[PDB]
Amino acid sequence: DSQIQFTRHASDVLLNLNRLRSRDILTDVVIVVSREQFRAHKTVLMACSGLFYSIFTDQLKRNLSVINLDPEINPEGFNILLDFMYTSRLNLRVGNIMAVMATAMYLQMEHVVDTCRKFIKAS
Amino acid sequence: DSQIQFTRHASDVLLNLNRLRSRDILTDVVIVVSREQFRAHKTVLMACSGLFYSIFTDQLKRNLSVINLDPEINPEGFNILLDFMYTSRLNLRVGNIMAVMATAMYLQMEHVVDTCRKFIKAS
Ligand SMILES: CC(C)NC(=O)Cn1cc(CN2CCN(C)CC2)c2ccc(NC(=S)NCCc3c[nH]c4ccccc34)cc21
Ligand SMILES: CC(C)NC(=O)Cn1cc(CN2CCN(C)CC2)c2ccc(NC(=S)NCCc3c[nH]c4ccccc34)cc21
């Protein structure tokens, strides 16, 4: 409310969280997408994705160390979205727009889908 | 670099991380401060504190579920800093500044220490 605001703190936290991912420090889940595998932190996955929230919030699945995604998910599209989660930067190109949008819908990241919609429209 | 920037994503992630802490979801450590206990996420602690980074980055201590802080640490001051880590907001009042500053020194949060110094200077 009337507390002092650190305007860079949130971005600095996310940057260190991504650094921890890049060194595999306290990563607690691998996400299998067809042939690929991505290690990550369940907390960040839950904070950023409705699908991952709905999985790990259920005590039936909260302790899983492996999550197999839908085999139709494109790994490049997932990687772009995983990067976004940890960076706030979304790499939308003409060559990946369709794969990134579809993957964002499957992961229930509405703002990204909403931004994919505006990207479409601005093309 | 040339990707789309989501200016509110990092703050949105931290808010959900704090929500997860408030429901004790995926918390993986308890910090003992005199007669008090605080549950938290090791990744957030490490991202925010040089002390907590140095502890959990060491494989000798990375798997600890309990951390006992120095008995001289004031629990209210620790709580204020724990809140700051998860909110980017620092509750500095001249009734608590000394105990917050000394705690931020122990936790190796230089940004906060530097701010406490200017709070003193701005009187
Ligand atoms: C970084 C940020 C912008 N990314 C998201 O918000 C992605 N996301 C997208 C959704 C799904 N949306 C939600 C809004 N709704 C109208 C349409 C469907 C979603 C859901 C959960 C989380 N993760 C966490 S920790 N949420 C804590 C609050 C909460 C949400 N639903 C709850 C259910 C029970 C208790 C708490 C909650 C992230 C989610
Ligand atoms: C959210 C942000 C504003 N809060 C901090 O930065 C609090 N903090 C304060 C310090 C201690 N400072 C650091 C600067 N130095 C000149 C004086 C002492 C500190 C240390 C680690 C972390 N956590 C993480 S993940 N760091 C990843 C990068 C890294 C730092 N040291 C490394 C050593 C080896 C490998 C990597 C690194 C947080 C730290």
Curated annotation (Swiss-Prot), chains A, B:
Phosphorylated by ATM in response to genotoxic stress. Phosphorylation induces its degradation by ubiquitin/proteasome pathway. Expressed in germinal center T- and B-cells and in primary immature dendritic cells. Changing S54A: Abolished ubiquitination by the SCF(FBXL17) complex. It comes from the Eukaryota. Changing H111A: Abolishes interaction with NCOR2 and HDAC2, no effect on interaction with CTBP1 and transcriptional autoinhibition. It is found in: Nucleus. Transcriptional repressor mainly required for germinal center (GC) formation and antibody affinity maturation which has different mechanisms of action specific to the lineage and biological functions. Forms complexes with different corepressors and histone deacetylases to repress the transcriptional expression of different subsets of target genes. Represses its target genes by binding directly to the DNA sequence 5'-TTCCTAGAA-3' (BCL6-binding site) or indirectly by repressing the transcriptional activity of transcription factors. It is linked to Chromosomal aberrations involving BCL6 are a cause of B-cell non-Hodgkin lymphomas (B-cell NHL), including diffuse large B-cell lymphoma and follicular lymphoma. Approximately 40% of diffuse large B-cell lymphomas and 5 to 10% of follicular lymphomas are associated with chromosomal translocations that deregulate expression of BCL6 by juxtaposing heterologous promoters to the BCL6 coding domain. Translocation t(3;14)(q27;q32). Translocation t(3;22)(q27;q11) with immunoglobulin gene regions. Translocation t(3;7)(q27;p12) with IKZF1 gene 5'non-coding region. This is B-cell lymphoma 6 protein. It comes from Homo sapiens. The gene is BCL6.
